[PDB]
Structure 1
């Protein structure tokens, strides 16, 4: 009922790279600082739930920036591999709601007051990803005005073409009928749905043998949006079961404010084309 230690296994790493040194585990595993007094059992779940999410969001931003570089270089297969990993990261972010759903309102009311006004609405990394996918709201910079350095990193992504705008620029380089404004415009203004892209996407979806690279990237972007909307929905269903329709710590109306983001679309013309697409030829 025991596995013997194999010969050859290293035990003295004191002058070599260590597992705890590589992964900076003393730093990482001292970052959990529950505030309840006396200690509340459920506050450790609460901290770890958001911290695991912030680590996945860090990786998601790293991958999405690389997907943008690939698109800029017309490196389609490399972009698609990076988007495949991005999808898996968003899947873990969505799946993990099942842990926090074991937190009841009885448990949460034991420590919610220690949070003060702290909220996920104040997540810089979340807002960075929202902006990079295209949901640019300059009103969010004033939310971070109390933190100038974070505000600057959000302004940077605000001023750059989104992942979706980089996709349109890739379609323009391959002779699609992309309007000239996608070559240069005020990137800080959120993309507005453009009916002139309808015939561009109809031609891709209806001639998939010719436009297989474009078609596969369209579907990768619908997959990314769909998974992000599921993250939003599972978060909002968690809020409903934990605080119901109470106002949020961050000062919003709570569920209704979250429902307003579920009504937004990152890649509107990819959804809109469904109403007019015919059979593949």
Structure 2
């Protein structure tokens, strides 16, 4: 409706916090809200990222950089957000730890969407979303479509850059594989910025998104460490496995031969 609380639908949003602790624990609210605010930022992040792909498809560089600039800010919020949770100590967590289901952020569809959209494709990850065919659908679509990185590659191909013909038609279902034959394409760009400034721009943006995304990944792991700790794989050690993953290897590799 026309009301502030009506437009934002606050009665719906503000009644979604249901602590399931009979006695009612003080620190459960934070646990819930810290999860919901993230889910909200992820939604927006997905909305802006999808626009990054369309803009690239359309050779609209200034538009894409814009949406990417917002994504970074959103991603940064996701990251910065862990600071509040860092206040949840083991003595507090202990109070409502039990009444928690076996669930985990691994079931985060939106998160998965992001991961897929950025290039970390994984077919076997479709079954974990069977309960909801609609969402599984939205996930399969992005899974079959080239990633942000791939659309960025097909973009460079449309403007003289020696992009391996394979990036014209392939099974996008399979996650991108580090392609060494992509190093010279990025050496040219990094050695002639004044000329390839557009591409240059998107490159650093891409590096920004991946980097900021790793910060989130890391801050995420550290928080878990101080809450439930390690125990050394699927768990705290697993979150350490994701840190090794990269969205745009080629981009980082070139850093080792650029200007040699």
Same fold (TM over 0.5): yes
- Report the equivalent of 2:150: 165
Q: Which residues of 2 match residues 56-205 of structure 1 at below 5 A? A: 56-205=41-190
Looking at structure 1, the residues matched to 218 and 17 of structure 2 have their Cα atoms a distance apart, in angstroms, of: 27
Structure of greater Rg: 1
Cα deviation digits, residues 78-109 of structure 1 (max 9, x gap): 10111010000001000010000000011112
- Runs (4+) of structure 1 exceeding 3 A deviation are none
Q: Is 42-51 or 133-142 further displaced after alignment?
A: 133-142
Q: How far off is 1:246 after superposition?
A: 4.6
Query: d(CA) in 1 for partners of 2:134 and 2:197?
Result: 42
Kept after mapping to 2: 8 A contact 1:32/1:44 = yes
Aligned length: 260
Matched-pair contact (CA < 8 Å) for 1:134–1:266: yes
Structure 1, unmatched stretches of 5+, are 1-15
Contact 1:246 1:253 in 2 (8 A): no
How high is the TM-score relative to the length of structure 2? 0.97
Mapped pair 1:278 → 2:259: yes
Q: Could you tell me whether the CA contact under 8 Å between 1:138 and 1:188 is conserved in 2?
A: yes
CA distance in 2, matches of 1:115, 1:153: 28
- Name the SS for the 2:99 alignment partner: helix
Deviations 1:89-146 (A, max 9, x none): 0010000100000000111121122221111110000000000000011121122233
Q: Which region of structure 1 is more displaced relative to structure 2, 25-34 or 144-153? A: 144-153
Q: Report the Cα distance in structure 2 between the residues aligned to 1:246 and 1:174, rounded to whole angstroms.
A: 51
Change in 2 beyond 3 A, CA 1:145/1:246: farther
- Say if 1:171 and 1:178, in contact at 8 Å, map to a contact too: yes
Of the structure 1 ranges 146-155 and 104-113, higher mean CA displacement relative to structure 2 is found in 146-155
- Report the CA distance between 1:253 and its aligned residue: 3.1
Return the alpha-carbon distance in structure 1 between the equivalents of residues 133 and 48 of structure 2: 25
> Structure 2: how far apart are the matches of 1:132 and 1:109?
36
Q: CA deviation at 1:150?
A: 2.2
> Partners in 1 of 2:124 and 2:91 — Cα distance?
35
Aligned counterparts of 1:71 and 1:176: Cα–Cα separation in 2? 15
Q: Distance in 2 between matches of 1:52 and 1:213?
A: 34
Distance 1:85 1:62 in 2: 11
Q: TM-score, normalised by structure 1?
A: 0.90
1:42, 1:99 → 2: CA distance? 12
1:255 Cα deviation from its structure 2 partner = 1.4
